[PDB]
Amino acid sequence: MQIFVKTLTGKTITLEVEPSDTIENVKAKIQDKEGIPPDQQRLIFAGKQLEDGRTLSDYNIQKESTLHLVLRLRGG
Amino acid sequence: MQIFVKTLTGKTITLEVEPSDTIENVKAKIQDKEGIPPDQQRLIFAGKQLEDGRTLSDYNIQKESTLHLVLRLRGG
Amino acid sequence: MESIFHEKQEGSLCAQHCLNNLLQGEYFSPVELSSIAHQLDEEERMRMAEGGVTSEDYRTFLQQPSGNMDDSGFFSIQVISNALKVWGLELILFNSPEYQRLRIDPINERSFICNYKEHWFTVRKLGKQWFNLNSLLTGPELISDTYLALFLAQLQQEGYSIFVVKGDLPDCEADQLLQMIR
């Protein structure tokens, strides 16, 4: 299904994922669009940080879910 | 001397204090004015946190100077 | 360069320097970043509580990351729009066509922040010129009046989200002493 990834800048990335998709794979998908390094991609959902070794269903994530990506995007 | 107090809502109140007035005593004044307890109240003066047991004199807070009333630091 | 709020920092918390040099001088605080950010959360929470469409409403909007303290220490426009808001200043979009159409001389303005997602430019009027500074910029890029007009246009073309601050911004000593420079 499609999800809404809120990036720290005022952008919402609508990407298509899978229920059994691992959080790490989700990062790769975001990296393909924004180019943000998956390693530095601090994916947080509803305050709870998404662990790379976990899946979307692990955090009860469904379609149109509001995800939040945290990282030092400003740089300086 | 009448300084000021900047709330997190955009409201400012003409706080009247003395040169030797302590931050704690100031918090009391704010407690009556607003209602928020001193332990919840946080006061900042230009990137600097004001300690309850410190006088405004040392802080250098001149006549008619604003103050930052922080009260939200919870996260999870 | 006598009394000027020139703070230095590196490694995240970039917003702490952006606000520290927003209104020309310092007045904000690092801990405030989580407070002003939670202001939106506070209102959104009570809003989503009543207008709850799904279960995620009182879940994801009950604990909105960055709003309730950030992990790395970076905040988006969530703290910018609120920072000026609590002081009595307004934020205008100079990049969005629906607003850019106002066509107001940027040299007449007070300060504006440019966002390119990967970087933000902290530009503010100083004395009789415009200065751009950051945590990754020790040299204030002197922006001339004629250059500013082009700079603003270049930003729009590049895709830089220009947040112009309208109203009376409290200038510091750096504004008065900069009046003697060219």
Side-chain angles (χ1 to χ4, degrees), chain A residues 6-11 34 40 42 44-49 59-62 65-76, chain C residues 11-12 14-15 18 56 59-61 63-66 70-72 74-76 78 113 115 117-122 134-136:
Chain A
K6 295 278 184 185
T7 356
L8 275 179
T9 185
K11 185 186 180 172
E34 298 311 297
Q40 299 163 212
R42 190 97 315 251
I44 311 178
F45 182 69
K48 286 79 197 72
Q49 312 212 337
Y59 297 82
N60 294 90
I61 299 174
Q62 299 287 266
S65 299
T66 7
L67 276 76
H68 195 116
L69 187 56
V70 168
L71 75 135
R72 35 170 282 175
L73 264 170
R74 195 179 206 268
Chain C
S12 290
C14 329
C18 180
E56 269 45 86
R59 211 241 291 212
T60 325
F61 301 85
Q63 297 167 88
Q64 184 57 212
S66 309
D70 192 71
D71 172 272
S72 308
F74 177 51
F75 308 85
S76 57
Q78 57 186 92
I113 311 298
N115 149 268
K117 301 157 61 196
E118 57 128 274
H119 270 112
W120 297 50
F121 285 148
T122 324
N134 263 340
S135 326
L136 203 75

Side-chain angles (χ1 to χ4, degrees), chain B residues 6-10 44 46-47 49 65-66 68 70-76, chain C residues 26-29 31-32 34-36 38-39 42 63 68-69 82 85-87:
Chain B
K6 265 294 182 194
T7 58
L8 297 176
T9 358
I44 284 87
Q49 313 194 337
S65 301
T66 343
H68 249 123
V70 167
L71 60 120
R72 290 291 90 154
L73 205 64
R74 210 78 63 193
Chain C
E26 173 65 282
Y27 236 141
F28 299 91
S29 29
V31 287
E32 182 190 347
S34 312
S35 270
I36 52 179
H38 208 262
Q39 284 318 276
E42 230 79 65
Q63 297 167 88
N68 67 340
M69 179 168 291
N82 206 96
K85 209 134 282 289
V86 297
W87 281 100

Side-chain angles (χ1 to χ4, degrees), chain C residues 151-177:
Chain C
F151 188 64
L152 267 291
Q154 294 306 274
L155 298 181
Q156 292 158 328
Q157 302 173 214
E158 189 62 55
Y160 261 91
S161 328
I162 309 161
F163 313 111
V164 181
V165 187
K166 268 293 195 194
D168 296 87
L169 275 69
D171 57 270
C172 58
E173 194 180 290
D175 185 70
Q176 281 291 88
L177 73 96

Side-chain angles (χ1 to χ4, degrees), chain C residues 91-96 98-100 102 161-164:
Chain C
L91 203 66
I92 306 297
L93 272 303
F94 203 69
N95 64 279
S96 316
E98 62 195 73
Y99 241 116
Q100 172 207 30
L102 39 79
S161 328
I162 309 161
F163 313 111
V164 181

Side-chain angles (χ1 to χ4, degrees), chain C residues 6 8 122 131-143:
Chain C
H6 185 210
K8 178 62 184 295
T122 324
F131 284 47
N132 180 36
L133 275 165
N134 263 340
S135 326
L136 203 75
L137 282 175
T138 182
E141 306 189 306
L142 306 167
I143 302 174

